[PDB]
Ligand binder design. Structure first.
Ligand code: MN
Ligand code: MN
Ligand code: MN
Ligand code: MN
Lengths: 129, 129
């Protein structure tokens, strides 16, 4: 960058030796705690997240919850599941869900989901509003 | 939102009793491993990072490195230490550095830093590029 060049030129002009980008320093970013509030909870225990724009951190969040709370049934209703992950991506929101086992639909909750037999929700692992 | 409105109306028309944002699901964003490569290493053991724009994640990284590698001497040379942390912030890069004990300078490496007595760098704690 202009600054790196100026600093390098200065050190050389004064005859100071130096190593440039020669050493890496390892570090760990600590794990962090968060909470996610799905939009709707149906009587049969299915949670439904309505979603327009679906950002990367949001997608990672769903994968984390699936690994951390396998018993939760969290599905997504998209304004459009055909939307691509980003400006030039080949993958759609829907394809991402298919790849990771996330049940999804577009615009409205499918009649079939509402009809699914009730199942237990581990509310003990959850926090009420 | 529009989608939330349409889904809730669909559920209400079918007489489905739902809970809206009534439950919070706790989750953890996993610790992550990284490496940081300072721009310059001077003969006396001082590492210097040249920096123009200095974003929030970059500032956080520097604090993590100071906590996890207290044996290293990492300083920063800014294009301008007067720059505010972000649009609207009353705090400058320099003030942030002062608060956290980070030595800094503007435009070039201080001749006085170059003159400081050599101190051994624990290379066994680092990884060569
Ligand atoms: Mn919501
Ligand atoms: Mn939503
Ligand atoms: Mn660099
Ligand atoms: Mn730099």
């Amino acid at each position: 960058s202009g600054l790196e060049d100026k600093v390098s030129k200065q050190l050389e002009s004064k005859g100071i030796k130096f190593e440039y980008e020669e050493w890496k320093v390892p570090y760990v970013i600590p794990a962090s705690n968060h909470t996610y509030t799905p939009d709707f909870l149906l009587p049969n225990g299915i949670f439904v997240e309505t979603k327009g724009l679906w950002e990367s951190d949001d997608r990672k969040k769903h994968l984390l919850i699936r690994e951390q709370h396998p018993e939760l049934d969290i599905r997504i209703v998209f304004s459009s599941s055909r939307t691509k992950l980003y400006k030039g991506s080949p993958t759609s929101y829907g394809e991402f869900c298919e790849k990771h086992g996330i049940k999804f639909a577009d615009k409205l909750i499918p009649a079939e989901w509402i009809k699914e037999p009730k199942k237990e929700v581990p509310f003990d692992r959850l926090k009420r509003k």
